[PDB]
């Protein structure tokens, strides 16, 4: 399935002036657009070649929508201060995620529309796309206002309508980039320890997208393993490693296994 998601952050800046306001758009977990109120003449900007095919109308309407959202977020921040009885002199953050997960057949699998204040859940549109979960009393006040306004109906119309429609358009126009894959290049490194035994480290490098499985097996059973979180290389590709400690001279009984959507089949390697 595929997803289109927007991640928005506002951070208040006590003293005088506008909060920092940021939006980022993703198709299946990769960034394609961004807006940042700290840029000099802030516009929605492309973050990949494929979306640059959109004309000046797209860029202008998106820039305008972001600036409209900046104003709603400014009002939101001040309201949150009043609901929590907080002072004007602290920094506070409001985050929002919205978007759609869509199946092969074009069905909307799940729509999202949810907010966090100071890093905690605030209010979320439920799976039914008709009711709101409110985390606390502040968010219950918001919920009653949104129930009276008919917010969920309008939100659901975006998530079922434009969100699905634009995702299909983006996949049509940009599927060469959005659906691209770079399989892992794997190798094993060998590190003698002071203790007289060996660390074998299985590296997966240069892969895209991020999801991967790395395992070690001994006599073809799984097992003892240290495993770093998947991390960016800085050039658009990802890295991971997994390691085990084995006897010197018995390295050959251990195999490293790599599964990734870019491979024609699972990779099996040894020292």
């Amino acid at each position: 399935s595929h997803s289109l998601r927007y991640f928005v952050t506002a951070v208040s800046r006590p003293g005088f002036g506008e909060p920092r306001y940021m939006e980022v758009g993703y198709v299946d977990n990769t960034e394609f657009v961004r807006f940042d109120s700290d840029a000099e003449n802030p516009r929605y900007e492309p973050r990949a070649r494929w979306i640059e095919q959109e004309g000046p109308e797209y860029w202008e309407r998106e820039t305008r929508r972001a600036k409209g959202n900046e104003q709603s977020f400014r009002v939101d921040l001040r309201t949150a201060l009043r609901y929590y009885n907080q002072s004007a002199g602290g920094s506070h953050t409001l985050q929002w995620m919205a978007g759609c997960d869509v199946e092969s057949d074009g069905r909307l699998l799940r729509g999202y529309w949810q907010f966090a204040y100071d890093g905690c859940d605030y209010i979320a549109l439920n799976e039914d796309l008709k009711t709101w979960t409110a985390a606390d009393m502040a968010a219950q006040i918001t919920r009653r206002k949104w129930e009276q306004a008919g917010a969920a109906e309008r939100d659901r119309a975006y998530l079922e309508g434009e969100c699905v429609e634009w995702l299909r358009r983006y996949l049509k126009n940009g599927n060469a980039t959005l659906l691209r894959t770079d399989p892992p290049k794997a190798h094993v490194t060998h590190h003698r320890r002071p203790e007289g035994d060996v660390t074998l480290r299985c590296w997966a490098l240069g892969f895209y997208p991020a999801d991967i499985t790395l395992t070690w097996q001994l006599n073809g059973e799984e097992l003892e393993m240290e495993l770093v979180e998947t991390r960016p290389a800085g050039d658009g590709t990802f890295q991971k490693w997994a390691s085990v400690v084995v006897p010197l001279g018995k390295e050959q009984k251990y195999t490293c296994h790599v599964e990734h959507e870019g491979l024609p089949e699972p990779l099996t390697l040894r020292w």
Binding site: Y6, V8, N69, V75, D76, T79, A98, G99, A138, Y158
Partner: peptide, 9 residues
């Protein structure tokens, strides 16, 4: 294209 958060807290 992205959403509009027109309903305020």
């Amino acid at each position: 294209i992205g959403p509009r958060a027109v309903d305020v807290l």
